[PDB]
Design a protein around this motif. Sequence first.
Motif, PDB file in Angstrom:
ATOM      1  N   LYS A   1      53.974  56.300  15.541  1.00 15.71           N
ATOM      2  CA  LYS A   1      54.426  56.861  16.803  1.00 15.71           C
ATOM      3  C   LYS A   1      55.628  57.775  16.575  1.00 15.71           C
ATOM      4  CE  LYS A   1      51.988  53.115  18.030  1.00 15.71           C
ATOM      5  NZ  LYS A   1      50.958  52.548  17.113  1.00 15.71           N
TER       6      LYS A   1
ATOM      7  N   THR B   1      58.869  61.375  20.887  1.00 13.06           N
ATOM      8  CA  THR B   1      58.298  61.984  22.083  1.00 13.06           C
ATOM      9  C   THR B   1      57.420  60.994  22.841  1.00 13.06           C
ATOM     10  OG1 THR B   1      58.346  64.110  20.933  1.00 13.06           O
ATOM     11  CG2 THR B   1      57.040  63.977  22.943  1.00 13.06           C
ATOM     12  N   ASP B   2      56.724  60.110  22.121  1.00 14.63           N
ATOM     13  CA  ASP B   2      55.939  59.066  22.775  1.00 14.63           C
ATOM     14  C   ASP B   2      56.827  58.117  23.570  1.00 14.63           C
ATOM     15  OD1 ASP B   2      54.275  60.353  20.936  1.00 14.63           O
ATOM     16  OD2 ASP B   2      53.055  58.556  20.620  1.00 14.63           O
TER      17      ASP B   2
ATOM     18  N   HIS C   1      59.731  58.828  24.771  1.00 13.30           N
ATOM     19  CA  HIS C   1      60.166  59.647  25.897  1.00 13.30           C
ATOM     20  C   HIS C   1      59.132  59.642  27.011  1.00 13.30           C
ATOM     21  CE1 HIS C   1      62.498  62.381  28.101  1.00 13.30           C
ATOM     22  NE2 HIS C   1      62.003  63.525  27.663  1.00 13.30           N
ATOM     23  N   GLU C   2      57.849  59.745  26.656  1.00 11.76           N
ATOM     24  CA  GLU C   2      56.815  59.766  27.685  1.00 11.76           C
ATOM     25  C   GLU C   2      56.624  58.390  28.316  1.00 11.76           C
ATOM     26  OE1 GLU C   2      53.323  61.358  25.802  1.00 11.76           O
ATOM     27  OE2 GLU C   2      53.976  63.443  25.908  1.00 11.76           O
ATOM     28  N   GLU C   3      56.846  57.308  27.566  1.00 16.99           N
ATOM     29  CA  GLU C   3      56.663  55.990  28.178  1.00 16.99           C
ATOM     30  C   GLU C   3      57.862  55.554  29.008  1.00 16.99           C
ATOM     31  OE1 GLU C   3      53.725  54.295  28.201  1.00 16.99           O
ATOM     32  OE2 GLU C   3      52.863  55.808  26.888  1.00 16.99           O
TER      33      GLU C   3
ATOM     34  N   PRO D   1      60.286  57.324  32.390  1.00 15.61           N
ATOM     35  CA  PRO D   1      59.890  57.144  33.800  1.00 15.61           C
ATOM     36  C   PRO D   1      60.147  55.744  34.342  1.00 15.61           C
ATOM     37  CG  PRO D   1      58.216  58.361  32.605  1.00 15.61           C
ATOM     38  CD  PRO D   1      59.173  57.853  31.580  1.00 15.61           C
TER      39      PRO D   1
ATOM     40  N   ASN E   1      67.265  61.979  36.857  1.00 11.55           N
ATOM     41  CA  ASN E   1      66.967  62.425  35.506  1.00 11.55           C
ATOM     42  C   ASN E   1      67.791  61.606  34.526  1.00 11.55           C
ATOM     43  OD1 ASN E   1      69.568  63.690  35.925  1.00 11.55           O
ATOM     44  ND2 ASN E   1      69.087  65.053  34.206  1.00 11.55           N
TER      45      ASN E   1
END
Length: 104
Positions: free
Chosen positions: A53, A56-57, A59-61, A64, A74
């Motif tokens: 991994k 960035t992964d 960050h995407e999980e 949020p 933010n």
Amino acid sequence: TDTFQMFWLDYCEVNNTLILFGKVKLKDDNCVSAMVQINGLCRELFFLPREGKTPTDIHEEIIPLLMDKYGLDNIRAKPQKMKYSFELPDIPSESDYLKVLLPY
């Protein structure tokens, strides 16, 4: 000539703020006590990616769900090659982490 200058001595933690205690010089060269409430401080968290991994992964999980959990519009986040050399066995010597600053 345009900045507030203080000699800090002690501190305290209150309402997720840090207040510094110190002395300030006056126009008559005398020094009096003063305090500085510091807002906007943030915790540095480093998420260690799983095998294969990328930061960035992460960050995407989690960013949020972090916005959900603390109700933040933010959240500043960025990757970096941090070095680890301590007693936790499963963490490698060096890896790319996701540095996430969550305000206090």
